């Protein structure tokens, strides 16, 4: 039940071994392999590294050579004998274990991976690769600080050790330790530098490019290369080119449409657009989705395969080459790659070209770098043509933003909303004390003294009223009044779990409470709800410029992660700022937390990496998002929501005016209603949560797509 989102994929670090002192027609075949490997020749690698065995049976340092190789090209239960033989030969070969840790881990073993990796720093405590892999590990479990530690291990042991470097740079972002963050942005660069220089895998994933200072070229070279390493998986299969579809005849006229992706399940993807396959025209489309990953028992993934008019689990197709077959079998024309760089990606799929046109859509927030795909879908917002170098892919704009969301659908109760005047008679609140139903009205019809402000009804300190501020106090789940259920917004998965993860629509009428979350009812709150490590030194002065001129706001925050959160307050003093000043809470049910953005005043983007489903979620609770689209795919997704909406107001070109348009927000009153109005009028309004007409741009666009391909034109880009 651990909340899903975007992260990158696992990474590993693989030794090879040389041999010395050994039979020296093997040691000269082990040993050249080596080199070979380090050039990208994998094929020949292989074959020197089986004449060495053939030449000498026994050798250890082959078998675990070969081994490595053969997990780079899929093979891995093969690299798994393997490296057996080489332990069996030499029982203290740590080199073999660490690397065999990382075949488990690629297998999902983890309690396997890490007794290898543990094995093999006892045999040798000096030995730096494994302390590296032994800290991914920690990593992706999220011990970010076991991770930390054992990454330092490593760079004590050996200095100059890119993979160890960049994931710990990863690491200390989640956690926002800046100690020393300029040279650190220096060295990453550095490191990028040399690698790419020296046709080396860089060891920057590039899901993570989109935080350091790297030039577009760099973060487009770094895609390419882990482009490149699907071809080595798929150049095993020796496939050929496939033959691809020219008409719809085969397909009644009707457009063959392929979504893949690891997400459909309880991921943001699925909150985004479980809609939209129930929404393709049956009359022009025919729906296939593939599923990358195993169901999960949710709704999402129930909704998806029932409205998909083909649902295909590839979960079971661990073979990518029978995946690709299937694909083409099923005769798709535009198939969409959902992951990217993503965790569950399985990118050789596309790399064997199963379908005329591969496009990028909606879950990776960045260039594919490869030769394989297509087109990227955007808007012209996000990917404006002055920077279409910094994309591999040809632009595929939408009418107004690419980015969709499925509140509309997933939460009908914050549609309408109601307040209690509790302080009272001075000063009415839209967002101290919430009420959120679907039997809302209904409720209201029963209490006469409920006063109506536009519009927004009132409810005064009533009997009732007192009843519910009580509950809330005292800590009760749901209470009862004149039949209706009226319940603490805290306690949702206790009432319906279903409605707390956003699976089903909540029955009872929800009460959400500033008091709830230890925020202030006499103040301006500013908020972000994004994960810790889309935040940087410079937005967090940023945000603090904000707040000094605004005197009793504060800055709401989530424990996304805990350890984050002493690191931030520090440095918010260095800069401000007493620690008052900042309040964090807990990550949410999916529920709760968009429903909890209704307290807030206002919610401050992040500058390096937007918020994107995050700034969805906030723009449904009728808070206005102020942003400043930057450089980055990523860190103008904001804008590009924002100029849907209907809110150009909100978005800043520079920190001034950023820092300015926060401020009048906190300060002028009226202009903040306003405003506020806007959003929560607009986002009913506006297309921007319209999976109807969203998913019928879209029909649009992949028919232009199409006939471009018919005509036998080559991919370019698509801005009608
Ligand atoms: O208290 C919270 C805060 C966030 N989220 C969700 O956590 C995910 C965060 O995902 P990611 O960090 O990938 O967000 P994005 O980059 O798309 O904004 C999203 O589904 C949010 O709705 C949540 O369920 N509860
Ligand atoms: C906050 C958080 O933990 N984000 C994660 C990161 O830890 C991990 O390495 C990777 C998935 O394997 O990216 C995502
Ligand atoms: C590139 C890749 O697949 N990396 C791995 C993944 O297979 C594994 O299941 C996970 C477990 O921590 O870590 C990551
Ligand atoms: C996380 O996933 C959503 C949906 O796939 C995607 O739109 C978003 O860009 C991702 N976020 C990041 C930071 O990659």
Same mark, same amino acid.
């Given at each position: 039940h651990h909340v899903p989102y975007?992260?990158?994929?696992?990474?590993?670090?693989?030794?090879?071994?040389?041999?010395?002192?050994?039979?020296?027609? %093997?040691?000269?075949?082990? $040993? +050249? =392999?080596? @080199?070979?490997?380090?050039?990208? #020749? &994998?094929? /020949? !690698?292989?074959?020197? *590294?089986?004449?060495?065995?053939?030449?000498?049976?026994?050798?250890?340092?082959?078998?675990?050579?070969?081994?490595?190789?053969?997990?780079?090209?899929?093979?891995?239960?093969?690299?798994?004998?393997?490296?057996?033989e080489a332990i069996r030969i030499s029982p203290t070969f740590?080199?073999?274990?660490?690397?065999?840790?990382?075949?488990?881990?690629?297998?999902?073993?983890?309690?396997?991976?890490?007794?290898?990796?543990?094995?093999?720093?006892?045999?040798?405590?000096?030995? %730096?690769?494994?302390?590296? $892999? +032994? =800290?991914? @590990?920690?990593?992706?479990?999220? #011990? &970010?600080? /076991? !991770?930390?530690?054992? *990454?330092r291990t490593a760079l004590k042991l050996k200095p100059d050790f890119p993979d160890a470097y960049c994931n710990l740079a990863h690491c200390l972002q989640i956690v926002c330790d800046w100690t020393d963050?300029?040279?650190?942005?220096?060295?990453?660069?550095?490191?990028?530098?040399?690698?790419?220089?020296?046709?080396?895998?860089?060891?920057?994933?590039?899901?993570?490019?989109?935080?350091?200072?790297?030039?577009?070229?760099?973060?487009?070279?770094?895609?390419?290369?882990?482009?490149?390493?699907?071809?080595?998986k798929i150049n095993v299969?020796?496939?050929?080119?496939?033959?691809?579809?020219?008409?719809?005849?085969?397909?009644?006229?009707?457009?063959?449409?392929?979504?893949?992706?690891?997400?459909?399940?309880?991921?943001?993807?699925?909150?985004?657009?479980?809609?939209?396959?129930?929404?393709?025209?049956?009359?022009?489309?025919?729906?296939?989705?593939?599923?990358?990953?195993?169901?999960?028992?949710?709704?999402?993934?129930?909704?998806?395969?029932?409205?998909?008019?083909?649902?295909?689990?590839?979960?079971?197709?661990?073979?990518?080459?029978?995946?690709?077959?299937?694909?083409?079998?099923?005769?798709?024309?535009?198939?969409?790659?959902?992951?990217?760089?993503?965790?569950?990606?399985?990118?050789?799929?596309?790399?064997?070209?199963?379908?005329?046109?591969?496009?990028?859509?909606?879950?990776?927030?960045?260039?594919?770098?490869?030769?394989?795909?297509?087109?990227?879908?955007?808007?012209?917002?996000?990917?404006p043509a002055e920077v279409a170098e910094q994309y591999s892919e040809k632009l595929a704009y939408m009418p107004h933003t690419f980015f969709i969301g499925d509140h509309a659908n997933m939460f009908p109760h914050l549609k309408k909303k109601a307040v209690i005047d509790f302080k009272s008679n001075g000063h009415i609140y839209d967002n101290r004390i919430v009420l959120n139903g679907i039997d809302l009205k209904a409720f209201l019809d029963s209490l006469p003294d409920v006063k109506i402000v536009k519009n927004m009804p009132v409810i005064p300190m009533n009997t009732i009223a007192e009843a519910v501020i009580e509950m809330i106090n005292r800590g009760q789940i749901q209470i009862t009044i004149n039949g209706f259920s009226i319940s603490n917004g805290?306690?949702?998965?206790?009432?319906?779990?279903?409605?707390?993860?956003?699976?089903?629509?909540?029955?009872?009428?929800?009460?959400?409470?500033?008091?709830?979350?230890?925020?202030?009812?006499?103040?301006?709150?500013?908020?972000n709800f994004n994960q810790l490590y889309k935040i940087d030194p410079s937005t967090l002065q940023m945000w603090a410029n904000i707040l000094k001129r605004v005197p009793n706001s504060v800055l709401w925050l989530?424990?996304?992660?805990?350890?984050?959160?002493?690191?931030?307050?520090?440095?918010?003093?260095?800069?401000?700022?007493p620690q008052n000043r900042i309040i964090f809470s807990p990550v949410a049910p999916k529920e709760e937390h968009v429903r909890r953005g209704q307290l807030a005043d206002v919610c401050l983007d992040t500058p390096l990496c937007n918020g994107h489903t995050t700034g969805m979620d906030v723009l449904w609770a009728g808070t206005p998002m102020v942003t400043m689209p930057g450089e980055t795919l990523a860190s103008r997704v904001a804008a590009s929501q924002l100029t849907c909406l209907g809110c150009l107001e909100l978005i800043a070109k520079n920190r001034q005016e950023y820092e300015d348009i926060?401020?009048?927000?906190?300060?002028?009153?009226?202009?903040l209603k306003k405003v506020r109005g806007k959003v929560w009028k607009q986002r009913i309004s506006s297309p921007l949560f319209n999976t109807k007409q969203y998913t019928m741009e879209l029909e649009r666009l992949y028919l232009q797509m199409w006939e471009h391909y018919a005509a036998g034109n080559k991919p370019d880009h698509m801005i009608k």
């Open positions: 975007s992260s990158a994929q696992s990474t590993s670090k693989t030794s090879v071994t040389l041999s010395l002192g050994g039979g020296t027609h %093997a040691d000269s075949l082990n $040993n +050249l =392999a080596n @080199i070979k490997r380090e050039q990208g #020749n &994998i094929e /020949e !690698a292989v074959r020197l *590294y089986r004449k060495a065995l053939e030449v000498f049976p026994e050798f250890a340092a082959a078998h675990s050579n070969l081994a490595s190789v053969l997990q780079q090209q899929g093979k891995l239960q093969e690299a798994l004998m393997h490296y057996k740590a080199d073999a274990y660490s690397n065999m840790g990382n075949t488990l881990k690629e297998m999902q073993d983890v309690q396997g991976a890490l007794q290898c990796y543990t094995r093999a720093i006892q045999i040798n405590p000096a030995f %730096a690769d494994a302390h590296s $892999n +032994l =800290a991914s @590990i920690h990593k992706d479990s999220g #011990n &970010i600080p /076991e !991770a930390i530690a054992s *990454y963050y300029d040279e650190r942005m220096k060295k990453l660069v550095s490191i990028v530098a040399d690698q790419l220089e020296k046709n080396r895998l860089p060891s920057v994933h590039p899901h993570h490019s989109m935080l350091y200072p790297l030039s577009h070229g760099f973060r487009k070279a770094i895609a390419e290369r882990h482009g490149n390493l699907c071809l080595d299969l020796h496939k050929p080119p496939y033959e691809h579809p020219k008409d719809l005849k085969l397909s009644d006229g009707r457009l063959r449409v392929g979504y893949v992706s690891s997400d459909f399940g309880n991921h943001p993807t699925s909150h985004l657009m479980q809609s939209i396959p129930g929404m393709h025209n049956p009359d022009k489309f025919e729906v296939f989705c593939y599923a990358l990953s195993p169901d999960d028992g949710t709704n999402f993934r129930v909704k998806v395969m029932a409205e998909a008019n083909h649902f295909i689990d590839l979960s079971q197709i661990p073979c990518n080459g029978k995946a690709a077959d299937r694909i083409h079998q099923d005769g798709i024309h535009i198939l969409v790659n959902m992951n990217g760089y993503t965790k569950g990606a399985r990118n050789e799929l596309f790399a064997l070209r199963p379908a005329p046109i591969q496009a990028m859509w909606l879950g990776y927030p960045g260039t594919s770098g490869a030769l394989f795909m297509d087109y990227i879908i955007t808007d012209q917002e996000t990917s805290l306690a949702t998965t206790q009432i319906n779990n279903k409605a707390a993860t956003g699976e089903e629509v909540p029955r009872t009428i929800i009460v959400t409470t500033r008091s709830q979350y230890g925020l202030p009812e006499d103040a301006i709150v500013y908020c989530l424990r996304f992660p805990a350890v984050g959160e002493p690191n931030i307050q520090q440095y918010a003093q260095n800069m401000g700022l926060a401020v009048k927000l906190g300060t002028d009153l009226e202009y």
